[PDB]
Design a binder for this molecule. Structure first.
Ligand code: LU8
Ligand code: LU8
Ligand code: LU8
Ligand code: LU8
Lengths: 289, 283
């Protein structure tokens, strides 16, 4: 493996564009603070039937050590277009491109949520536009399974893993922010994913042009919380103030954006059991034009 | 910067139901590569989770190098990479080799040292660890005459064990499964059987016993759970101490030590730290 350039550096660790056997690969080196994510991601990628066009493809995972130093590596396919977050910053979308992006994310999420009889049912727990990569075919793939929860219907087994990491604060569902979420209930984790999906739908739809109008890229709740919002800042707006992302009135002139606004509201009910399923979101997006 | 990951597999040194172990080469150095069967994937995950929790480093613990997971077309490939000990397992070594007093004590004190390191919680450190499959095939002989403990695939931090080495409370299913000290006491029982296997190969007054595994004279090869229960729990049999040991001060002391690892009552058994102290006062 040859490490050619750092494409990301944060509390998580670092991601490198590298070369391996003549192909671009992505090489994530985890921070020691996030060792439990590395192991959880490795448990998830053990599953051969996880592989899917809308899930980041795995090549290898390694833990290496000499003396008291440990390195933790995850090697994946490389997506040179970067994350959906990166992509939306300076690109606008037409109807076809906007629906292709969001259907592909719904397709990835429905694939995670639905058990294959194999691949367990999987809830992601940190869905957000930085955790979605854009592919040269205009579809996306979901990345970062370090917080994932797994459930097996045949044996009624729930594997919540061992990870004190929590979701990205800006995307946390009301029940996560107020800590009332039912921790022994697999459906609870799927419903957190649906909330976050609705927020990603909103971020994407803002960038779709209608009638010569488009919104600038903004992250969820940009208008109502401080920069670098705390857990308590988010709890205030989502749980106390019952805030949801605003729907620009220009959307109601466009049938596609009207349909997407309806879908993102059905992701944002305070009652988690009221939210749409990933399969239902996929079927709705398959029908919308 | 270049990350040279390739390991050349050179010769197979072990093949079983667990998978295979190979002598391999990395940057001109021997390493040992354990390739896991589908059957035994959980042993890879457990050892990896433990080493991700605490990077164990001790002269009498097989040295960790790497855990690798590689995506294949239709399967996941799982390798554990460690230090390579060309002399092989204690089991292997005892078949042909006899021991003198110094080599016997050096072997058993090195095993006690590695086991006490696993067992002890260090604050500030490492969690306490019980091995749960200690046996002479899971001990490697180093060129300096000391041994190291291998295979933490069943280890517990605070697959079942090899039946021949199971303590009575494991066979009669009375072990207090919620209680960490219970697992230390299971290891001490197994340690006592290993000490018997080694002691037999120590020469005194021109006499040595042939290598035999524990309970070779009372159970079949691949004994059943029931075969072991009847011997260890119902009849309360223990390995034979030969008369010739009682002419030799070292083997007399080691017979006493192994008795104190084999009490039916787990809480009566010696601790690994007490075994180390006893061994440093022998000879
Ligand atoms: C997995 O195993 C082996 C790895 C290596 C190896 C190769 N490149 C670099 C390194 C290294 C350099 C520097 C640090 C530290 C130093 C101080 N501080 C600043 C934190 C960072 C850590 C690691 C190593 C250890 C060599 C080995 O053998 C010669 C290994 O054994 C098979
Ligand atoms: C989210 O999570 C993981 C992501 C990736 C990953 C895979 N392909 C491409 C990338 C990428 C490349 C380049 C940019 C550019 C964007 C604009 N500008 C030039 C700065 C940088 C962004 C992103 C990444 C980050 C790999 C991972 O593991 C190896 C991830 O973790 C699972
Ligand atoms: C991915 O996989 C394998 C990798 C290796 C390997 C080969 N060269 C160099 C390394 C290395 C070590 C450590 C650093 C440190 C330097 C200090 N810096 C602050 C943090 C990072 C960099 C590089 C490694 C880990 C060997 C393997 O096998 C023995 C691997 O496969 C299991
Ligand atoms: C107990 O288990 C594990 C053991 C090992 C391991 C480490 N060094 C050396 C060995 C070995 C080398 C050589 C011989 C023979 C073959 C050559 N000649 C004909 C006589 C001697 C036997 C044994 C092994 C098997 C590694 C492991 O993990 C990678 C093990 O699993 C944790």
């Amino acid at each position: 493996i040859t490490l050619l350039e750092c494409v990301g550096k944060g509390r998580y660790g670092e991601v490198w564009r590298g070369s391996w056997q003549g192909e671009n690969v992505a090489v994530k080196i985890f921070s020691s603070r996030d060792e439990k994510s590395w192991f959880r991601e490795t448990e998830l990628y053990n599953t051969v039937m996880l592989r899917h066009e809308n899930i980041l493809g795995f090549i290898a995972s390694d833990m290496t050590s000499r003396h008291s130093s440990t390195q933790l590596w995850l090697i994946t396919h490389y997506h040179e277009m970067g994350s959906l977050y990166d992509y939306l910053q300076l690109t606008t979308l037409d109807t076809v491109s906007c629906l292709r992006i969001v259907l592909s994310i719904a397709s990835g999420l429905a694939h995670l949520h639905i058990e294959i009889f194999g691949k367990p049912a999987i809830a992601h727990r940190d869905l957000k536009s930085k955790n979605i990569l854009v592919k040269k075919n205009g579809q996306c793939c979901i990345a970062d399974l370090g917080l994932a929860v797994m459930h097996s219907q045949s044996t009624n087994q729930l594997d919540v893993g061992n990870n004190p990491r929590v979701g990205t604060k800006r995307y946390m569902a009301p029940e996560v922010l107020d800590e009332t979420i039912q921790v022994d209930c697999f459906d609870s984790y799927k419903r957190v994913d649906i909330w976050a999906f609705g927020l990603v739908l909103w971020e994407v739809a803002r960038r779709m042009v209608s009638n010569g109008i488009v919104e600038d890229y903004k992250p969820p709740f940009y208008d109502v919380v401080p920069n670098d919002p705390s857990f308590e800042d988010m709890r205030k707006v989502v749980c106390v103030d019952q805030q949801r992302p605003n729907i620009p009135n220009r959307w109601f002139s466009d049938p596609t954006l009207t349909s997407l606004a309806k879908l993102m509201k059905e992701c944002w009910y305070q009652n988690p059991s009221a939210r749409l399923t990933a399969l239902r979101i996929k079927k709705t997006l398959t029908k919308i034009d």
